[PDB]
């Protein structure tokens, strides 16, 4: 077992290790174990968890825990302190102060409480006179946005936009725009108007959006649409139906996302697992949302988009082992009607469906079903899960008669399998190794029902698998394909080419004739045209062949620029393979297979260069909208390996590179995130930070290439991450601001304490110059007492190379502008004269100019230093004759400091 006690310390240590994420979890986990028989052991936990939360900016959480602590002992000074600091952040300075106050008189002396009250004072002081100022900024915009007191589109759009801007701007900016819930109606009014533009509604929605990240605001939003709770939940979930446009549905699904988040204290985009305590509490609401969202899984009135969204909704919030709801939910989902209904959607294609579905609707059911099974974990459960799918596989099969009516039940039982095979494949496989499915297979394969014919090839093609055990229904199946191929119905030839493709160049000759025939053949046809071509690209010869023909790339682009997520796993794999983006664990021979000059040396560039000249990227963006995993991982490797040719990044940057990889980081899975970053770090460096990371784009572009240095034990693109991070911290302070807070420098510093890495140090150099190029970290490298200064002076000197000078030297002058500075040097820098002399007339131009200007202002402020003319005075003179150089300025500068 794991005692309630010890688990707690395990957390307090987590705090001390500075990984507050674990602490939070550990403390809640700790809390779990104890209940209302350990009384006291709880309050202490809440009082603790709150520090953690407080550190991961979970103010609403911090607050909850504190008051949760005081519930026990109103004196808990640690509670009252943090609860104030929480409220303080929540823009709720009011009772914020009266908490940081009453806190003080419980521990009169505490540099801490004090530093807060001082702040909370200039707070209540500017309080009122400051709120009413926003109240007017609000109203004036509210006036032009919703209350139609505006003329012309644009004008109304910017009001809404500013409203959105001010909305996220701060914690108050939100509360302000929320305007006590007066924002909701105004937004519902736009949703409800048939004639208002999508961009308007979308925006208006995103405003209402942010305002409900607040657990309390959100929960009041969910229950405020009807006096009857259940009905009120319906309304919200159903909003996504009001309109059919893509962006609208999406922007609305998030509102439902928020509801989940708020319902169980969780946010997947923050690695905030749910807090069981909250979730348990307001379960009555979880239930209803689940139920309402479940019911519309099959509601025929509920469209296709909403349909797919409602699926992703479960794939992000039900799967307790994937940042979703807490454990116990997904089980009650399968143990009732959740899985069955989710299953009924599996066996549903456009052509034959009982409720609107689209080509894409499949993926959304696959992954979700995959992960649903993954979220089963126990044994007793993996049982009730397969045990249910089984029951469903029977009921279905045992109704596959041989009549126009019963044919349908074979199309069902069929797709129910293609699906279950791209998803929880294992449960799928174990379903077809029941040769009671091979007859039906054959039957339809042979029928004259063009549909049944095609979706049979697709059923074995989707069985190609890898190993054996099921090579049974392939024994006969594969040949079946060979026949079905001859067919004159495109839809049956193409669907057949695959599989017979995923198992020589004649296949490749065909997949081309489909794809190039852009106008003629259709979309869903060329989808498989791609899928086939996909598997072929793994061979070198094919790799070089493809990139050789323009049209095929020109059309393979038009295919994504129209199909999207339908051609991802596939289109990625074509570009992934075509650019060699996968990896390998790096008598005798085999230095020959490594050949295929088209998979080796400079051939990669012949392809990469070519792919890029034909969209390539715009395509990646087009099909990158998938709650996939590996699919992203491919666009990642594909974009990483795209930007590594210089004059190339100068375009991919303009084709939405940055924006995408950025997404890839948050979104992509595992090594995917990693690859994304490197790609960015490598995209930016020998390129202007302005013409790449504009409009606050630059902020998010940090957490990544700061988490990638951590693994600094050697390797990676640390050098690429630096040349950008440097070129990044150059312009703007908000930049350097984040770079710092990131707890990043305690690491970047180590790219300074190195020997033979002449390059990985010239980086940290040019970086740390622009990193202290303004406060916060300027006074942090001068007073404290960290040997820092030593090198900034030692480096302008230790010149045998270069850059490490000009850098740590340009940072010698601009740094000397401080007096307290010359104080830590001249008295701790034993042997400074030699060093000074070195840099004195050092032969590295700019270094004897930045070096001298650095020393020329050390004696220009503080006489006890100017008096130190030991050999120094020499240079100053010498440098004043014919050197032609300008080092005479920083030289004749050391002069004036003698009067």
């Amino acid at each position: 077992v794991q005692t309630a006690e010890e688990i707690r310390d395990e957390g307090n240590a987590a705090v001390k290790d500075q990984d507050y994420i674990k602490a939070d979890e550990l403390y809640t986990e700790a809390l779990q174990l104890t209940t209302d028989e350990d009384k006291a052991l709880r309050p202490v936990l809440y009082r603790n968890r709150a520090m953690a939360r407080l550190k991961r900016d979970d103010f609403e959480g911090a607050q909850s825990d504190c008051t949760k602590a005081l519930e026990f002992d109103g004196a808990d000074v640690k509670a009252l302190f943090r609860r104030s600091l929480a409220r303080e952040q929540l823009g709720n300075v009011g009772p914020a102060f009266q908490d940081a106050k009453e806190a003080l008189r419980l521990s009169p002396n505490d540099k801490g409480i004090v530093e807060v009250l001082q702040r909370l004072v200039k707070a209540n002081n500017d309080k009122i006179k400051q709120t009413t100022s926003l109240a007017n900024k609000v109203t004036d915009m509210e006036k032009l946005a919703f209350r139609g007191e505006a003329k012309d589109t644009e004008q109304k759009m910017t009001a809404l936009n500013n409203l959105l801007v001010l909305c996220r701007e701060s914690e108050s900016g939100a509360t302000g725009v929320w305007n006590q819930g007066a924002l909701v109606p105004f937004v519902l009014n736009l949703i409800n108007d048939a004639s208002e533009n999508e961009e308007v509604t979308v925006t208006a929605i995103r405003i209402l959006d942010e305002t409900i990240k607040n657990s309390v605001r959100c929960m009041k939003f969910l229950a405020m649409h009807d006096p009857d709770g259940p009905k009120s939940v319906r309304f919200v979930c159903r909003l996504m139906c009001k309109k059919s446009t893509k962006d609208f549905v999406d922007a609305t699904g998030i509102l439902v996302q928020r509801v989940f988040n708020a319902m169980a204290k969780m946010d997947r985009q923050k690695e905030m697992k749910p807090d069981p305590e909250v979730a348990e509490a307001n379960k009555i609401w979880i239930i209803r949302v689940l139920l309402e969202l479940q019911e519309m899984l099959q509601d025929p009135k509920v469209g296709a988009v909403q349909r797919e969204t409602c699926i992703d909704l479960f794939l992000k919030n039900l799967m307790h082992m994937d940042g979703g709801i807490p454990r116990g939910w997904s089980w009650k989902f399968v143990e009732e009607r959740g899985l069955l209904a989710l299953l009924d959607v599996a066996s549903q294609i456009p052509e034959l469906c009982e409720y609107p579905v689209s080509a894409e609707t499949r993926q959304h059911v696959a992954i979700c079903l995959q992960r649903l099974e993954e979220d089963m974990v126990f044994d007793t459960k993996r049982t009730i899960f397969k045990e249910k799918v089984d029951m469903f596989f029977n009921a279905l099969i045992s109704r596959c008669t041989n009549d126009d009516e019963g044919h349908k039940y074979r199309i069902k039982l069929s797709c129910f399998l293609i699906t279950m095979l791209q998803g929880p494949v294992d449960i799928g496989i174990n379903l077809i190794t029941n040769d009671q499915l091979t007859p039906i297979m054959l039957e339809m394969a042979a029928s004259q029902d063009h549909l049944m014919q095609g979706i049979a090839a697709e059923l074995i093609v989707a069985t190609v698998s890898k190993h054996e055990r099921a090579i049974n229904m392939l024994k006969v199946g594969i040949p079946v394909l060979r026949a079905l191929y001859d067919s004159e119905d495109p839809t049956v030839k193409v669907r057949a080419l695959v599989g017979l493709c995923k198992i020589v160049i004649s296949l490749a000759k065909t997949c081309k004739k489909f794809l190039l025939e852009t106008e003629k053949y259709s979309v869903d046809i060329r989808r498989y045209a791609c899928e086939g071509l996909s598997y072929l690209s793994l061979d070198a010869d094919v790799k070089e062949w493809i990139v050789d023909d323009s049209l095929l790339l020109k059309a393979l682009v038009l295919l994504a620029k129209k199909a999207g997520a339908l051609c991802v796993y596939t289109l990625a794999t074509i570009y992934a393979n075509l650019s060699n983006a996968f990896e390998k664990p790096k008598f005798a021979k085999h230095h020959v297979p490594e050949t295929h000059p088209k998979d080796t040396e400079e051939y990669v560039e012949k392809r990469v260069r070519a792919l890029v000249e034909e969209g390539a990227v715009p395509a990646c963006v087009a099909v990158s909208k998938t709650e996939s995993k590996n699919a992203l991982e491919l666009i990642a490797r594909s974009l990483l390996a795209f930007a590594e040719y210089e004059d190339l990044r100068g375009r991919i940057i303009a084709e939405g590179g940055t924006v995408l990889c950025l997404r890839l980081t948050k979104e992509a899975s595992g090594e995917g995130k990693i690859k994304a970053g490197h790609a960015i770090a490598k995209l930016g460096a020998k390129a202007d930070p302005m013409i790449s990371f504009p409009g606050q784009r630059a902020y998010e572009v940090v957490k990544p290439l700061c988490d990638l240095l951590h693994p600094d034990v050697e390797g990676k693109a640390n050098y690429d991450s630096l040349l950008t991070l440097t070129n990044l911290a150059s312009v703007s302070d908000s930049i350097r601001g984040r770079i710092l807070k990131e707890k990043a420098i305690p690491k970047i510093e180590e790219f300074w304490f190195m020997t033979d890495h002449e390059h990985l140090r010239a980086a940290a150099a040019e970086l740390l110059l622009n990193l202290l190029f303004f406060e916060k970290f300027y006074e942090e490298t001068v007073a404290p007492g960290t040997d820092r200064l030593k090198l900034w002076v030692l480096y302008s000197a230790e010149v045998e190379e270069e850059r490490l000078s000009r850098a740590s030297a340009a940072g010698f002058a601009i740094l000397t502008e401080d007096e307290n500075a010359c104080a830590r040097i001249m008295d701790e820098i034993k042997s400074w004269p030699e060093v000074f002399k070195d840099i004195a007339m050092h032969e590295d131009a700019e270094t004897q100019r930045r070096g001298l200007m650095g020393i020329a202002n050390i004696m220009h402020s503080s006489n006890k230093l100017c008096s130190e003319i030991v050999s120094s005075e020499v240079f100053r003179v010498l440098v004043a004759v014919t050197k032609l150089g300008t080092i005479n300025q920083e030289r004749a500068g050391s002069t004036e400091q003698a009067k």
């Binding site: 307090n12 943090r82 505490d110 801490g112």
Partner: peptide, 8 residues
Amino acid sequence: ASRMEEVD
């Protein structure tokens, strides 16, 4: 005497 920002 334990300045804040340290848990017990």
